[PDB]
Amino acid sequence: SRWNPMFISDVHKISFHPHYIGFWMGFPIRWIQIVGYIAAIDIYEGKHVLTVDDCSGMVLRVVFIIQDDFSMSKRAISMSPGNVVCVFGKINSFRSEVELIAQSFEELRDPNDEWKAWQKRMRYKKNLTKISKNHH
Amino acid sequence: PLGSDSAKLIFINQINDCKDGQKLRFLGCVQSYKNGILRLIDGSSSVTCDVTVVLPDVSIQKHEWLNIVGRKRQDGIVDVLLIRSAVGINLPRYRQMVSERQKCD
């Protein structure tokens, strides 16, 4: 569908039925965008994981599959805790804790980029909530 | 070192409304920086920030704005974990969004 800009706490609320897409307020969700600062960096075999916090009450593990994009993966571990990133990716529900498989990301170095991201997310959530209430 | 808990985005004037040990994120204006203690203010409110373990590698200018992520030690004192300059930030829009995030579910 779209790029669904979401808060991390809401990402953790998406419902899955294991048996490609999840559902948020009844809406099918696959591709999502999140914005927050890097709380941690963990290195795994074949993947780098950035834990991101957007202050929504939950943090999100963002996975960079090295072989899928060596370039982006390199930029990912070049980051430092405290850096703010805008990540676009797909939700992964293999484990009990959902994670985001990154497709692309950009570091946000303009201090104003974050509140604009919060603004966009509150507006998006409000609109989807209204639609969901009118159709249900 | 930051912990896996999510920070509560608040105003400095709300720090004393939170529990000790809680991770907090807030913006503040530099009033003074001495003896490992950074004093930040926002309007009539203020907070003492311990930056002894996270000494910036660049000089801090009086009245500049900083984004802080840290843990509340006790009323009026925060142990800093992360510091970043908020230079050029649109304060009115920033406070508007902080308020909205606290009010919207």
**Residue A76 backbone phi and psi in degrees, to 5:** -60, -50
Contact B63, B86 (CB under 8 A): no
Domain that holds residue B103: 1-105
Q: How was this structure determined?
A: X-ray
Contact B45, B62 (CB under 8 A): no
| Residue A25: burial class (beta carbons within 10 Å; 0-12, 13-18, 19+) | middle
Would you tell me which residues 21-50 of chain B have a C-beta closer than 8 angstroms to some C-beta of chain A? Answer: 25
Domain count, chain B: 1
Enter the tokens of residue A76.
Answer: 């990912």
Chain breaks in chain A (C to N over 2.5 A) after: 19
**B66: amino acid identity, one letter:** L
Could you give the 3-state DSSP secondary structure of residue A112?
helix
What does the CA dihedral A98, A50, B79, B97 come to, rounded to 10 degrees?
-70
Enter the tokens of residue A69.
Answer: 């994009």
- Tally Cβ neighbours within 10 Å of residue B47: 24
Beta bridge partners of A65: A47
User: What are the structural domain ranges in chain A?
Assistant: 1-136
Helix axes A112-135 and B91-103, enclosed angle (nearest 10): 30
Q: What separation in angstroms does the CA of A15 have from each of A60, A64, B10, B68? A: 16, 23, 29, 34
Element (H, E) at A9: helix A8-11
Domain with residue B78: its CATH number is 2.40.50.140
- Cβ distance B83 to A82 less than 8 Å, yes or no, reads yes
Of B82, B88, B104, the CB nearest to A111: B88
Measure the CA–CA gap between A39 and A3, rounded to whole angstroms: 24
What does the CA dihedral B38, B94, A56, A30 come to, rounded to 10 degrees?
-140
Contact B34, B76 (CB under 8 A): no
- Tally Cβ neighbours within 10 Å of residue B55: 10
- Cβ distance A112 to B93 less than 8 Å, yes or no, reads yes
Size of chain A in residues: 136
Would you tell me which residues 68-87 of chain B have a C-beta closer than 8 angstroms to some C-beta of chain A? Answer: 69, 82-87
- Tally Cβ neighbours within 10 Å of residue B41: 15
CATH number belonging to domain A1-136 = 2.40.50.140
Enter the tokens of residue B4.
Answer: 């896996």
Enter the tokens of residue B19.
Answer: 């529990």
